[PDB]
Amino acid sequence: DRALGQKLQMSNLVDVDWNSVISSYVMQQAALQASYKTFTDMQGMSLFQLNR
Amino acid sequence: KQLYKQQQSVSGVNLDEEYGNLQRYQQYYLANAQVLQTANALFDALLNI
């Protein structure tokens, strides 16, 4: 029983908390694709608009 | 990064106003060109005599 308690405390010190990590994982995924879209599109339109 | 951004604002280069100015000075150039054309026409009018 003491060993079970100990490994519980170990866990505590090291958490996947799967749900939090994957929720923030999806958030960051959306943010990533958004930032890349920003770069490509904005840079793009401005180039050939300005060159002309 | 922040101070570099600041500095670039002054000493940096950006293409938009550059090509706008290209148009602008080309127009100035053509203006002087037609001025020269007029300079021709007046003298020719003299020569007719």
Other C-beta atoms within 10 Å of B32: how many?
8
Rounded to the nearest angstrom, the minimum Cα separation between A27 and chain B is 27
Chain B residues within an 8 Å CB radius of A51: 15, 19
The half-sphere exposure of B19 on its side-chain side, counting CA atoms within 13 A, is 10
Q: What is the resolution of this structure in A?
A: 2.9
CA B34 to chain centre: 14
Other C-beta atoms within 10 Å of A50: how many?
14
Rounded to the nearest angstrom, the minimum Cα separation between A11 and chain B is 40
Contact assignment for A51 to B19 by CB distance below 8 Å? yes
Sign of CA dihedral B38, B44, B48, B49: positive
Q: How was this entry determined?
A: cryo-EM
Residue of chain B minimizing CA distance to A51: B19
In whole angstroms, what is the distance from residue B12 CA to residue B6 CA? 10
In whole angstroms, what is the distance from residue A12 CA to residue A6 CA? 10
Q: Which residue has the tokens 């405390």?
A: A9
B41-B42-B48 Cα angle (round to 5): 90
Q: Phi/psi of residue B12, each to 5°?
A: -75, 175
